[PDB]
């Protein structure tokens, strides 16, 4: 219970659950009426979630409070991803390079959320270009990167993902 005792594998299992709700509730809030936006990703619209839980709330809350910030980056990330041209073959390699560079100057909660955001954007981008069935691969990218690059330990040492529920204005 006391801070420091939580295992990285516990955080890893929780990360999968957090990321699913992050993806679901982020995609839900970004949809627009009257056909003015890009078509929804049905894999995200119907993504199965575990029964309502604290880890589900973490993913949802991080998507919601990040909404305004995320939307301001839409056009630039759309441009950068089109340039990157991620594919099923190179997505792992590119994800690893980008995530490593993200955290090179340190870990903080905002950068952890940015990694969730990148997973979301990468998964949406490859789906829009015809790569179905890849959301689980991207989820594994996120979970495994955190586990192998100290992020899961950083979260665990702070009590796990539940600590993120204190993020807010």
């Amino acid at each position: 219970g006391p801070l420091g005792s939580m295992s990285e594998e516990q955080v890893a299992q929780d990360t999968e659950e957090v990321f699913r709700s992050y993806v679901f509730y982020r995609h839900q809030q970004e949809q627009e009426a009257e056909g003015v936006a890009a078509p929804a990703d049905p894999e995200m619209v119907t993504l199965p979630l575990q029964p309502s839980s604290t880890m589900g709330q973490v993913g949802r809350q991080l998507a919601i409070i990040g909404d305004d910030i995320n939307r301001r980056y839409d056009s630039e990330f759309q441009t950068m991803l089109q340039h990157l041209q991620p594919t099923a073959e190179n997505a792992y390699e590119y994800f690893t390079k980008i995530a490593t560079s993200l955290f090179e100057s340190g870990i903080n909660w905002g950068r952890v959320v940015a990694l969730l955001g990148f997973g979301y954007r990468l998964a949406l981008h490859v789906y829009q270009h015809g790569l179905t069935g890849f959301l689980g691969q991207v989820t594994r990218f996120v979970v495994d990167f955190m586990l192998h690059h100290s992020i899961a330990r950083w979260i665990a040492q702070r009590g796990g993902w539940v600590a993120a529920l204190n993020l807010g204005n």
Binding site: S101, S105, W109, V113, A114, L115
Partner: peptide
């Protein structure tokens, strides 16, 4: 310009640090 994987990381860090400044007490 710089390679897209480099730019993406820079912008993720920029965004992350904005989030941290706004929401991490």
């Amino acid at each position: 310009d710089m390679r897209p994987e480099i730019r993406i990381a820079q912008e993720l860090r920029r965004x992350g640090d904005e989030f941290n400044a706004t929401y991490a007490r």
